[PDB]
Symmetry: C5
Subunit: 205 residues, 5 copies
């Protein structure tokens, strides 16, 4: 329909693209994990592979609209290319994250954006003790690679990772999965960097 086309053209083509958050105009990105599977555990390189989907949500005054001005339409799906997206990166990654879902996000009239990328991540994790009852605990920090706390802040709706869609017949049973927000200072940089530490405790069944 023409109403969606006009809205899309007015938002993206008519106006310039969002130049990203500043110190003056900061942004708060909400993060959330849905752990689906612990696929592989490589004891010889201390590399662990996870399959999950990341909930990324944020709000821009830039992407707002009056639905009554565009034929009562509240939300729409658009390619992630048309919009600004947060550069949420996994620090301990050992191989590029593989995208497992379409690069499409949902934009709502209040300017709120919802992007749920499905990924396969290979990160640094010593699996020593996965064969025992007590299990093994591993962590990976997700945050903006380039933006400090002054520009992007991170928030989680819950500290508990979504295991509702965790692979039943997986080789590794989840004992605990936590999404904890943390502020960190790095040697290089005086400014702090916010991340969400994904902490998973697991053991083979």
């Amino acid at each position: 329909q023409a109403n969606l086309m006009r809205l899309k053209s007015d938002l993206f083509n008519r106006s310039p693209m969002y130049p990203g958050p500043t110190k003056d105009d900061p942004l708060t990105v909400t993060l959330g994990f849905t752990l689906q599977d612990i696929v592989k555990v490589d004891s010889s390189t201390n590399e662990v592979d996870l399959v999950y989907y990341e909930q990324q949500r944020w709000k821009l005054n830039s992407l707002m609209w009056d639905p009554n001005e565009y034929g009562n339409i509240t939300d729409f799906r658009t390619s992630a290319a048309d919009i600004w997206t947060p550069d949420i990166t996994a620090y301990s990654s050992t191989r590029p994250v593989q995208v497992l879902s379409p690069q499409i996000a949902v934009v709502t009239h209040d300017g709120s954006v919802m992007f749920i990328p499905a990924q396969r991540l290979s990160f640094m994790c010593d699996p020593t003790g996965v064969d025992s009852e007590e299990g093994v605990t591993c962590a990976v920090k997700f945050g903006s690679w380039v933006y400090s706390g002054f520009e992007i802040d991170l928030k989680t709706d819950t500290d508990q990772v979504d295991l509702s869609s965790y692979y039943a017949s997986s080789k590794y049973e989840i004992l605990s999965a936590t999404q904890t927000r943390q502020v960190q200072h790095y040697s290089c940089c005086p400014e702090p960097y916010i991340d969400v530490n994904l902490v998973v405790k697991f053991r083979e069944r």
Copy 2:
């Protein structure tokens, strides 16, 4: 010929591209599988690799035409880039699907679009009991990743997967292969998401 060039121009260059389905203008995608081979089975990571080709069929009033108006031409082939395509994703995938066929679809004057992507998919599947006679059963859900039931609906012409082109000398014999439509409501989302559950029961020779 010039008649098709003009039709292709009047459809794609003259008019703006389809902004995807809405709640107001929904869409129904027909799905279907032709299972060719269960190539690999990784017992150590509970990963199974399938080679198949997926039938994607949908209809747009946008892509309709009077064949008499364009020198009696009923259907034409075009690059999938020129048209909107459904974001049909496999939920339990562990690695990005490899495309094994050209990105070309077929548009018919009634606006119906036919897209048959050939793919190699790696999904979550515990193959324990494949060495037995009873075999092992595994499933994978295919559906739109970003589009709900109110925007995209799924339909199957048959609940039986096409095994007519299944690799005779394959390492794994198909006992049963089913393609059935499902409706799911997830924790995240109030809106339902429609899928087609590919359920294959197999065993080694």
Copy 3:
């Protein structure tokens, strides 16, 4: 020189690109294989890897010219992107074909195009009996994925595959290599699909 530049301009920039074959304007693609190696045989997944270069040659009235008008020039090399190319796909492929040669084709004044892509293909093949004197026979169908016989037809100049450039110190010795045209009907489709059957009989040296 300017004569070729002008010809290239008058053919590709001045005129719109070929919309592909139709039922009304069909096309006949000539195919040919030069088998270079049987690199890998995977007994555990019944996957065989071939390296070859495929001769694709077709003619378009679209790409014709009077060499006198363009400073006596019979032919020219151009990127495969500048022209329409047939969507010749291997049916039993298990992994995407890897391109091993530049995407350049030769165009002649009579509109005839010659395209020789070098590829590495992984296809379905049970190698049981390769360790024997009698050897093992495997086949792979090459044809247009999206076009029926009414649109594209296939032809071979010879039924004998070119083994003149077959890797001498290969782990597998070729007993016979045949390229044969065939017409087939698929369960899905009422229209027939033409392919060239590559049939190779081989054994380890």
Copy 4:
């Protein structure tokens, strides 16, 4: 905000892109490594895999601005595509470097650019003696592939590689890690070529 959008426009859209350093206008790139993990060691091919992030730092008079002219904004983040980036290549690489971080850099009003690419590098390294107490030493040269000393000079803020973010539970312990500027002369070329030699001495736990 509009102030940054206008700045981004006046810098990138208004002016043509930087054609790279010349002999007349040379450039000095500061380099630095933060070694995160020695992932794999392949004794059979003398290939070693490192996970690290390289600090790239240069200044352009081209990218300078008066912050008081653009609503008091000192620095901003932009995609590496919008700007010129140094062609810092690892000489002994055996496989293409895998990018593990977003392609975003930070531009400051004095025209200074900070680019921190996270990478997985596979380079030539004989690990013979890694199983000993003394360990094994390996090196890799990083420098501009195409630009000489009179176009791109290299500098390090410190000769000590940043091990503050080195993977604690890694399979290989670090015994020493140093970033050292060196001038190379090649047979081919009249101008010398500058690099930073990354020298790491390590052993298994």
Copy 5:
């Protein structure tokens, strides 16, 4: 500076791109190899992996300029995309060459282009006897895939491959490495094709 920007504009934007060599206007490409390593040797598939960088040197009247007309500038670096590059291909390759260096070339005022791509090549080679003192000899032909001798000629400045940057602690010691120009006739084609046979004799240390 504006002097180079203007030169780059007057060369690439103001004039059409070079349509490649013809029979009427032939070209001579100089080739050179700098062998860095024999990384892997696969005895089971008779595949050998080489790491090297190839000298590609050619002169075009098209790319010439008066340096006194463009603010005394002799040479400049540009992306290989901006210019025509020879389609030098390795005949016995078994997997696509991996690019290990930036796609930048150097253009001199006399119209001479220098392009030094660093590559990892996997080619057909029986390594039987590498464990011996005598070693094993292997060869790979490099030449234009689509252009005959009438179009492109190849030349080497020396028949001795550059081993000055050969990995000292490599698993395989080079006994001899030769780059020799060869003319061959192929079954397919009446016209001859010029190659540069890279011939390496090596053994494990």
